[PDB]
DNA sequence: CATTTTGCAATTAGTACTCTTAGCTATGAG
RNA sequence: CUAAGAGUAC
DNA sequence: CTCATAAATTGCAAAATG
């Protein structure tokens, strides 16, 4: 039994992981449900038999009153978790209908292994409902808390157009983030938000870097 | 392995089930000579490989001058003098144990202690 | 002892420039081969005629 | 490629 | 180096005559399961034969190399451990005396 | 105090430098990369000094990695668009049983681990059980692509009689000695490939020679006195063909002998490589 | 290491264990095969007592007659913490039931690995004769398409012992012996994700790796 | 002065023996490999280290002997040009001859000179210059400082055409 | 034009010239010096170009003014008397 | 639905000096 | 004059 | 007799299958 206790310490460690990214995402998410010991998650998502549990491991989000005030345009968050290893078609378009009418812009998927490629091309929705997918292999470790990563913060539209403002800039002459990046998943970036990168220069004790996602 | 061939056609011999003694058989693949098989070992695989360390010792060994000498005990001898080399397996992670031939008797003795 | 041959002298393994050298083996071998390839620029007599 | 930069493909 | 030499390259006829005169087992009827400790003699890369006492011929090309019979520049080699004899008489060789 | 050596071309002393190259007629083994499929290389670099002197890069290569569990052998035969097996080879030359061919490569019947390497090729080339059969599967491979299939084995035969080891004999009758020299490369590739010896240093000097005024003269006059009596052949033809009259002096061109020494010597360029022939170094006598 | 557990070296030797990637080749003396009639008695006296404990433990009349057997090294199973259960248990799960596999205890003077080949209850009259190339097709994927222990592309791993500046409670900069990992080859996503590491301060010098875990910045 | 070139002499003996010691613990197959390296590479590199520290104590042994008038010690204190090494080389020990990184080579079959009888891992035997320029180097010394010079030189043309092609 | 050029009222560059402005500053007052440019400084025997440029930026007497172009192309007019040379 | 495999040339420290050789070969026809 | 080549300096 | 011509990087589109 012990793949048994140590998939499921990975689970706590991915649920850990996702519940910091939400947090971070700018949604009212408290601390303790981040800090929830391995005894505790153990305790209330996985069974008497000891087979840990995804169904009702699935939960919501919702914008805290800082992230309204500066994103009057996003709204709740559903985070789902599959069972079977294998993603398949059937699951999938129930959960992106069941976003759709629970009226969700946004709705971050974590599957265990893969996604069948005849999955993906439904991925996206209509909008302004958006389905990204995360690997629960890859949420084992928050990325963000690692040295080398700076602090990345997701800029307005005010601030982004008081930036180009303020250093006469263009859209392409802003260092470049790839929307592919980790922190760019992280942080669910669309093109053409520009983050706030704060670093602890060594020259200077604090720098501020700009990076528009492309 | 100690393969064998065929005695009638010289060709190589395999192996081969039989069903009325269930017996391992070597058959010919091509004039069907058949005969039994002395040992059931049909195949072997050196990952490490212990044999092939004192290749190419001859019995006028010593004649090579290349080849250094030494005064450590022959044991079946007990003579001074011997030839030696390290080990002829060129393998990067082959131990640097010497090998010694006696020049009155050509018996191979190493320097190891572990075996001994 | 088991020789089957000697050098006739160890000097004889320098080149005809090497050969000039006056204590190769008291010098750094980077500065023997610079003089090896400096005594052809040397200026002597080359021939008599 | 080419070579260099065989074909495709050869 | 200043005494070293090259070899101007010589027929190599009357070393495979020697060879064949002392002993040298022709090619074409070597059963190597009969001669296994078989020593093969090369002349300028052609395996010309297999000889059974190596020494004894290695002896006698020395000697006839050393009274002039055979060109000085003749280069013969004995690998004891390959058990391979190496005649080499063709030009481009560099070589020293000693 | 003048020691001589040298050549007085347009009265200029120039001096044949030393050309440093391969041996020929040795076998040279090589570990090659991982990546590429071949794992160790066997090559002889042919050439027979009493004949056409034409270089043939035989080359025996052992495909397969170590982990690769087939692991067949291949030789290169020149003006062959295929790696042949080694044994279809040993079967064309004359030599059809397994045990013959694994004796022509193998010496020690108690060396399992040659045999178990080399069962690969022998399993391969058990299509084949006939001397004419690998005789013919070479000429579908030869490409000529001008031969009928009858004649293929006789084309096969010119393949390995003047093309294949020219070093070792010219003429017929002597397969078996091609078939010993080809069994020594293979047991050569596989000592190397067996880890039971290093592979051959590229820069040991023993393995190289130095082709000195003698033999670069004597290949360069080759080719340029092949030039003059191909041009004698050419002025016979036209002259028998059109029926003049025929004199040696209007036959020989003493100028292509002459012109073609006097450029290659005068210009470093040994041809029709360069810096063969440099102007001789007069600024010191130790220079 | 996790800075609770910075100078504990048996943990540090666990991690050194649990990352370190093995193969069967670097435990495998030898390979053979064998031709036994019945998998009930084996012809070979040495490793007999293993069977008259197995076959006691415990189907049997569909099993190929032949065996494959391999040679491991004691001194492999001691410089690594293996044993000859995990790694039966090892190839019994990624062979499922189709090879019926069974090894002698660790105590044993000899470790061998002893595998027969199921058959199927249909009657095949062809591959009796190829069931040999069969059974060294599978030996061959069994030295080196499974892995006992350890991450992927991490072929070898050392133990350093470095000295780092740590702010001590009293206020000065200590000299703090700490236990590091340095591992050739870089499987960063799967090493950083492995417990009792510290997964902020993993490091790799292949920054391509980095970045493509970690992000541009 | 004569107690230091016997205490240099001795150091130099110490070391040949430490190394000769090394030696028979590798070839009585009792070393063990440092883990992540064979048993070669571990033998080479405690061959190394020891000759070069017994190199670096003679240099410092010569160093500490030369009085505060001697030149060459006042060019390198004043820090103008020279430094330790160069006293070591020119007045203790020459030291270890590296080609690649490692010992001289066996160019020959087994043996670096055909000077050396085969398997010979003798420190003099593969480049080892226990001679210092003042005393001069012997025949086969002076042909391993002879490829540890050429291999200086190649590197260095080698080294400038990368950093030209780099900085460009 | 009137889109590029900032206001004087909130030009944003450094007040203090740099390095780069004062050697071209220097360099084309020397030349139009040499080019027989009328000299707006009392003169106290010097006769290299020059030092005639550095005399005349050392009491401010140079009518130049910098345009610094911003990247995005506007720029900014900075007269060399409102400049102050520090290095 | 899942792999999978293969064949090679262009471009790659700066300057700076001196000297040597060669420039479609031979044959037809106006 | 151009091109090619060789040797050479740092 | 003289002019005119004989190391290490990259950068993939096929073709086959079950
Ligand atoms: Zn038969
Ligand atoms: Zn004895």
């Given at each position: 039994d012990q793949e048994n206790e140590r998939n499921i310490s990975r689970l706590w460690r991915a649920f850990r992981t996702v519940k910091e990214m939400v947090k971070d995402r700018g949604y009212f998410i408290?601390?303790?449900?981040?800090?929830?010991?391995?005894?505790?998650?153990?305790?209330?998502?996985?069974?008497?038999?000891?087979?840990?549990?995804?169904?009702?491991?699935?939960?919501?989000?919702?914008?805290?009153e800082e992230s309204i005030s500066k994103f009057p345009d996003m709204g709740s968050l559903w985070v789902e978790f599959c069972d079977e290893p294998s993603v398949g078609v059937k699951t999938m378009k129930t959960f992106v209908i069941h976003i759709q009418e629970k009226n969700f812009q946004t709705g971050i998927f974590v599957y265990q292994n893969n996604i069948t490629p005849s999955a993906m091309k439904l991925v996206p929705s209509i909008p302004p409902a958006t389905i990204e997918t995360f690997n629960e292999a890859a949420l084992v470790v928050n990325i963000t808390h690692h040295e080398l990563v700076p602090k990345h913060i997701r800029l307005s539209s005010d601030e982004?157009?008081?930036?180009?403002?303020?250093?006469?800039?263009?859209?392409?002459?802003?260092?470049?983030?790839?929307?592919?990046?980790?922190?760019?998943?992280?942080?669910?970036?669309?093109?053409?938000?520009?983050?706030?990168?704060?670093?602890?220069?060594?020259?200077?004790?604090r720098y501020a870097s700009y990076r528009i996602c492309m | 392995?100690?393969?064998?061939?065929?005695?009638?056609?010289?060709?190589?011999?395999?192996?081969?089930?039989?069903?009325?003694?269930?017996?391992?058989?070597?058959?010919?693949?091509?004039?069907?000579?058949?005969?039994?098989?002395?040992?059931?070992?049909?195949?072997?695989?050196?990952?490490?490989?212990?044999?092939?360390?004192?290749?190419?010792?001859?019995?006028?060994?010593?004649?090579?001058?290349?080849?250094?000498?030494?005064?450590?005990?022959?044991?079946?001898?007990?003579?001074?003098?011997?030839?030696?080399?390290?080990?002829?397996?060129?393998?990067?992670?082959?131990?640097?144990?010497?090998?010694?031939?006696?020049?009155?008797?050509?018996?191979?003795?190493?320097?190891?202690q572990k075996n001994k | 002892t088991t020789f089957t041959h000697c050098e006739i002298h160890p000097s004889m393994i320098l080149g005809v420039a090497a050969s000039i050298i006056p204590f190769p083996d008291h010098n750094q071998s980077p500065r023997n081969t610079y003089q090896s390839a400096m005594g052809k620029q040397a200026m002597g007599v080359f021939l008599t005629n | 490629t080419x070579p260099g930069v065989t074909x495709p493909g050869v | 180096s200043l005494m070293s030499c090259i070899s101007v390259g010589t027929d190599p006829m009357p070393i495979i005559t020697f060879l064949s005169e002392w002993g040298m087992e022709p090619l074409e009827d070597y059963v190597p399961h009969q001669s296994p400790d078989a020593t093969r003699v090369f002349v300028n890369g052609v395996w010309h034969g297999v000889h059974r006492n190596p020494a004894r011929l290695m002896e006698t090309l020395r000697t006839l190399r050393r009274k002039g019979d055979i060109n000085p520049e003749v280069s013969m080699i004995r690998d004891i451990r390959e058990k391979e004899l190496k005649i080499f008489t063709d030009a481009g060789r560099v070589y020293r005396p000693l | 105090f003048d020691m001589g050596g040298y050549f007085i071309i347009n009265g200029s002393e120039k001096v044949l430098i030393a050309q440093e190259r391969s041996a020929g007629n040795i076998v040279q083994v090589f570990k090659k990369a991982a990546p590429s499929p071949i794992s160790h290389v066997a090559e002889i670099r042919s050439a027979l000094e009493k004949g056409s002197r034409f270089i043939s890069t035989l080359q025996v290569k052992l495909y397969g990695r170590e982990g690769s569990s087939a692991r067949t052998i291949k030789a290169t035969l020149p003006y062959i668009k295929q790696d042949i097996p080694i044994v279809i080879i040993f079967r064309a030359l004359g030599i059809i049983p397994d045990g013959e061919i694994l004796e022509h490569i193998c010496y020690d019947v108690n060396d399992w681990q040659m045999l178990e390497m080399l069962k690969p090729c022998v399993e391969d080339g058990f299509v084949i059980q006939d001397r004419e059969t690998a005789l013919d599967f070479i000429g579908r491979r030869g490409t000529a692509l001008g031969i009928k299939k009858e004649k293929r084995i006789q084309y096969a035969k010119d393949?390995?009689?003047?093309?294949?080891?020219?070093?070792?004999?010219?003429?017929?009758?002597?397969?078996?000695?091609?078939?010993?020299?080809?069994?020594?490369?293979?047991?050569?590739?596989?000592?190397?490939?067996?880890?039971?010896?290093?592979?051959?240093?590229?820069?040991?000097?023993?393995?190289?020679?130095?082709?000195?005024?003698?033999?670069?003269?004597?290949?360069?006059?080759?080719?340029?006195?092949?030039?003059?009596?191909?041009?004698?052949?050419?002025?016979?033809?036209?002259?028998?063909?059109?029926?003049?009259?025929?004199?040696?002096?209007?036959?020989?061109?003493?100028?292509?002998?002459?012109?073609?020494?006097?450029?290659?010597?005068?210009?470093?360029?040994?041809?029709?490589?360069?810096?063969?022939?440099?102007?001789?170094?007069?600024?010191?006598?130790?220079? | 290491?996790?800075?609770?557990?910075?100078?504990?070296?048996?943990?540090?030797?666990?991690?050194?264990?649990?990352?370190?990637?093995?193969?069967?080749?670097?435990?495998?003396?030898?390979?053979?095969?064998?031709?036994?009639?019945?998998?009930r008695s084996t012809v070979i006296p040495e490793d007999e007592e293993i069977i008259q404990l197995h076959f006691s433990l415990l189907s049997f009349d569909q099993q190929?007659?032949?065996?494959?057997?391999?040679?491991?090294?004691?001194?492999?199973?001691?410089?690594?913490?293996?044993?000859?259960?995990?790694?039966?248990?090892?190839?019994?799960?990624?062979?499922?039931?189709?090879?019926?596999?069974?090894?002698?205890?660790?105590?044993?003077?000899?470790?061998?690995?002893?595998?027969?080949?199921?058959?199927?209850?249909?009657?095949?009259a062809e591959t009796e004769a190829e069931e040999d190339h069969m059974l060294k097709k599978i030996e061959n994927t069994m030295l080196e398409n499974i892995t006992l222990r350890g991450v992927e592309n991490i072929e070898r791993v050392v133990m350093m012992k470095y000295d780092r500046k740590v702010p001590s409670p009293t206020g000065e900069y200590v000299k703090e012996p700490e236990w590091v990992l340095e591992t050739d080859g870089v499987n960063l996503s799967e090493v950083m994700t492995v417990p009792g590491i510290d997964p902020t301060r993993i490091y790799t010098n292949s920054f391509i790796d980095i970045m493509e875990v970690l992000g541009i910045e | 002065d004569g107690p230091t070139m016997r205490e240099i002499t001795e150091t130099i003996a110490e070391a040949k023996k430490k190394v000769l010691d090394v030696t028979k613990e590798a070839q009585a197959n009792l070393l063990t490999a440092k883990h992540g390296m064979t048993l070669?590479?571990?033998?080479?590199?405690?061959?190394?280290?020891?000759?070069?520290?017994?190199?670096?104590?003679?240099?410092?042994?010569?160093?500490?002997n030369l009085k505060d008038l001697n030149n060459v010690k006042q060019m390198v204190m004043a820090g103008s040009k020279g430094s330790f090494i160069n006293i070591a080389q020119m007045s203790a020990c020459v030291g270890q001859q590296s080609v690649e990184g490692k010992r001289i080579a066996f160019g020959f079959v087994d043996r670096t000179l055909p000077h050396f009888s085969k398997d010979?891992?003798?420190?003099?035997?593969?480049?080892?210059?226990?001679?210092?320029?003042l005393r001069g180097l012997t025949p086969q010394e002076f042909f391993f400082h002879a490829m540890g010079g050429r291999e200086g030189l190649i590197d260095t043309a080698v080294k400038t055409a990368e950093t030209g092609y780099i900085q460009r | 034009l009137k889109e590029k050029a900032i206001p004087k009222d909130q030009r944003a560059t450094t007040p203090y010239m740099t390095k780069y402005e004062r050697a071209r500053i220097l360099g084309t007052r020397a030349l139009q010096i040499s080019m027989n440019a009328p000299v707006f400084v009392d003169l106290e025997g010097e006769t290299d170009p020059l030092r005639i440029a550095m005399k005349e930026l050392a009491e401010k007497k140079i009518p130049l003014v910098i345009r610094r172009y911003l990247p995005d192309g506007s720029f900014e007019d900075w007269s060399v008397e409102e400049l102050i040379v520090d290095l």
């Open positions: 408290t601390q303790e449900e981040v800090e929830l010991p391995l005894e505790d998650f153990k305790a209330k998502y996985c069974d008497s038999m000891g087979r840990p549990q995804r169904k009702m491991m699935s939960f919501q989000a919702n914008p805290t982004k157009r008081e930036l180009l403002k303020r250093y006469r800039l263009k859209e392409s002459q802003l260092p470049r983030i790839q929307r592919a990046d980790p922190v760019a998943l992280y942080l669910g970036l669309k093109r053409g938000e520009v983050v706030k990168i704060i670093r602890k220069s060594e020259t200077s004790g | 392995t100690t393969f064998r061939f065929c005695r009638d056609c010289n060709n190589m011999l395999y192996p081969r089930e039989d069903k009325e003694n269930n017996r391992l058989l070597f058959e010919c693949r091509t004039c069907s000579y058949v005969e039994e098989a002395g040992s059931p070992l049909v195949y072997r695989h050196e990952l490490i490989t212990n044999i092939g360390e004192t290749a190419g010792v001859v019995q006028d060994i010593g004649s090579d001058p290349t080849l250094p000498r030494s005064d450590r005990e022959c044991p079946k001898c007990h003579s001074r003098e011997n030839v030696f080399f390290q080990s002829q397996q060129r393998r990067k992670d082959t131990s640097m144990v010497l090998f010694f031939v006696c020049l009155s008797c050509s018996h191979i003795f190493t320097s190891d | - | - | - | 393949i390995l009689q003047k093309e294949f080891l020219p070093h070792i004999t010219q003429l017929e009758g002597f397969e078996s000695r091609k078939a010993f020299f080809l069994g020594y490369m293979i047991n050569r590739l596989l000592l190397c490939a067996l880890d039971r010896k290093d592979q051959d240093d590229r820069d040991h000097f023993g393995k190289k020679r130095l082709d000195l005024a003698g033999p670069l003269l004597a290949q360069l006059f080759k080719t340029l006195f092949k030039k003059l009596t191909k041009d004698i052949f050419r002025y016979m033809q036209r002259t028998v063909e059109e029926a003049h009259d025929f004199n040696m002096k209007l036959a020989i061109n003493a100028k292509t002998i002459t012109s073609g020494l006097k450029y290659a010597l005068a210009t470093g360029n040994w041809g029709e490589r360069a810096g063969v022939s440099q102007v001789l170094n007069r600024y010191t006598y130790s220079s | 290491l996790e800075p609770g557990h910075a100078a504990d070296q048996e943990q540090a030797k666990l991690i050194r264990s649990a990352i370190e990637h093995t193969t069967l080749k670097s435990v495998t003396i030898a390979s053979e095969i064998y031709y036994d009639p019945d998998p190929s007659p032949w065996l494959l057997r391999l040679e491991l090294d004691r001194a492999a199973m001691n410089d690594k913490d293996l044993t000859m259960g995990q790694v039966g248990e090892r190839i019994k799960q990624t062979f499922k039931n189709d090879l019926f596999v069974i090894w002698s205890e660790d105590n044993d003077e000899k470790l061998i690995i002893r595998c027969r080949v199921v058959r199927p209850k249909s009657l095949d | 070669r590479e571990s033998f080479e590199d405690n061959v190394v280290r020891f000759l070069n520290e017994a190199r670096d104590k003679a240099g410092r042994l010569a160093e500490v010979d891992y003798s420190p003099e035997s593969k480049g080892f210059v226990e001679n210092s320029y | -």
